[PDB]
Write a protein that binds this ligand. Structure first.
Ligand SMILES: CNCCCN1c2ccccc2CCc2ccc(Cl)cc21
Length: 375
């Protein structure tokens, strides 16, 4: 079979170029109104295929800028807007998570929400098509729905561990005596909302004969049932740019990396293939604090730290042992530089972090985090 890199090459090979299209897609936008201007342009095109031409984007009448750079900025800005839970289309999957899911009540907020989701799908599609990234991390069932993969009990673990553990107990033990019914109780606005999982659900006892169905219905309720039209609209837009059959060569981890550049960073592998300069070593107090910091950063923050030091967010295949710098093989590097007063600096050409010898973990935490959020 093919690993991720070979799959991606294969994928691009099949993604043929449109010839029956204008040679560029022109889009003039104002920053104060990027979302509305982008929506009007991208949903107004005569043919979705027009969006496959070279992006020719202009902000606030600013002429004389590299159209390649402007596009990348646009994908960033439009992501921030589209995925902002304030608009009510997406929401965080849990109070303690940073991953996004489709808001079941998206329609209450926005009568025209299906066209907004189709638009979001078109833009996601445009990112994949033009080799750019969306800035946003979705829950794993989002990616699976895109790929028409079944949502499973396991998917519930990454999103809600308490719930996952309860359904798993149900799967492994006879639940009959608990006298559970085919209903779901959701806590909202200081009240309990009960929903029947099937007709007459309240009077149907969960047992070993029907618990596989119970679990299926609970999972569909949590991730699918209430957001079918929304996701259908997103997929419609997405598939106007990327043939659905082509996207199927990827699994859900590969797809997420493809679209959003996010994934789980093996800090162990990162750690073992780091080099040290000018006094630093694996056992050095400051270094011990560095790895302590990295270990307690979110996957998002780990990625962005990697981005800061290397210049890119991509984690090399076969791990950090094969990381490249600017002039050949160059391991991730931490060098002692500067006094504790200044922030850490990055030499991207050498994948090198210049790290002052801070005198406290919390100071290191503060200084390192400050440096990253500028990138
Ligand atoms: C009240 N409805 C809000 C609609 C959200 N929306 C916005 C946001 C700001 C300004 C205009 C609009 C309408 C167009 C639009 C288009 C796409 C998306 Cl994703 C959200 C929105």
């Amino acid at each position: 079979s093919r690993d991720y890199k070979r799959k991606y090459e294969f994928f691009r090979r099949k993604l043929k170029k449109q010839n029956d299209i204008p040679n560029k897609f022109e889009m003039k936008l104002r920053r104060a109104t990027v979302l509305e201007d982008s929506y009007r342009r991208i949903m107004g095109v005569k043919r979705a295929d027009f969006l496959k031409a070279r992006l020719w984007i202009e902000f606030d009448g600013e002429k004389g800028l590299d159209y390649g750079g402007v596009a990348r900025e646009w994908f960033f800005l439009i992501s921030k807007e589209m995925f902002n839970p304030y608009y009510g289309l997406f929401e965080y999957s849990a109070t303690d998570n940073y991953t996004l899911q489709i808001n079941p009540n998206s329609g209450l907020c926005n009568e025209d929400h299906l066209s907004y989701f189709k638009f979001i799908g078109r833009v996601a599609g445009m990112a994949v098509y033009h080799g750019k990234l969306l800035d946003g991390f979705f829950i794993r069932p989002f990616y699976k729905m895109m790929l028409h993969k079944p949502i499973t009990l396991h998917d519930m673990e990454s999103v809600d561990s308490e719930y996952y553990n309860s359904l798993r107990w149900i799967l492994e033990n006879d639940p009959t005596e608990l006298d559970l019914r085919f209903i779901i109780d959701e806590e909202l606005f200081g009240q309990t909302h009960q929903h029947e999982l099937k007709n007459g659900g309240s009077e149907i006892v969960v047992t070993n004969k029907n618990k596989k169905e119970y679990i299926y219905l609970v999972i569909q309720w949590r991730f699918v049932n209430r957001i079918q039209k929304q996701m259908a609209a997103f997929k419609e837009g997405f598939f106007e740019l990327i043939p659905q059959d082509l996207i199927k060569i990827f699994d859900e981890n590969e797809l997420e990396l493809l679209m959003c550049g996010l994934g789980d960073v093996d800090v162990n592998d990162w750690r073992e293939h780091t080099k040290y300069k000018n006094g630093y070593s694996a056992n050095h107090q400051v270094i011990q604090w560095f790895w302590k910091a990295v270990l307690m950063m979110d996957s998002e923050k780990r990625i962005r730290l990697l981005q800061f030091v290397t210049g890119t967010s991509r984690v090399p295949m076969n791990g950090f042992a094969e990381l490249y710098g600017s002039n050949g093989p160059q391991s991730f590097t931490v060098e002692q530089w500067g006094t504790p007063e200044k922030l850490p600096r990055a030499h991207t050409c050498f994948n090198r972090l210049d790290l002052p010898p801070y005198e406290s973990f919390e100071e290191l935490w503060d200084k390192l985090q400050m440096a990253i959020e500028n990138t």
